[PDB]
Design a protein around this nucleic acid. Structure first.
Length: 56
DNA sequence: AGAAAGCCATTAGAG
DNA sequence: TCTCTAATGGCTTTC
């Protein structure tokens, strides 16, 4: 298991503020900028969306 | 069709 | 011990 840095998490949460779903093109940009795999980005949003439906 | 992505519940590792 | 969330697996949906 990898722990995400405060920076990685912020960038991701800032993006989620705009699109709760990512495009393949956007997912690739974020994966590179944050040094995570596309799978991790996909899962982060999967989880974030779940938290959102139960936390809002 | 079939590959890719999403929904969920649940697991388990880090601090 | 306990909390939070990265990750997993099976279905289901989208293209």
């Amino acid at each position: 298991r990898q722990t995400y840095t405060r920076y990685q998490t912020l960038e991701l949460e800032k993006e989620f503020h705009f699109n709760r779903y990512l495009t393949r093109r956007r997912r690739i940009e974020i994966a590179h900028a944050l040094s995570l795999t596309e799978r991790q980005i996909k899962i982060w949003f999967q989880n974030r969306r779940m938290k959102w439906k139960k936390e809002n």
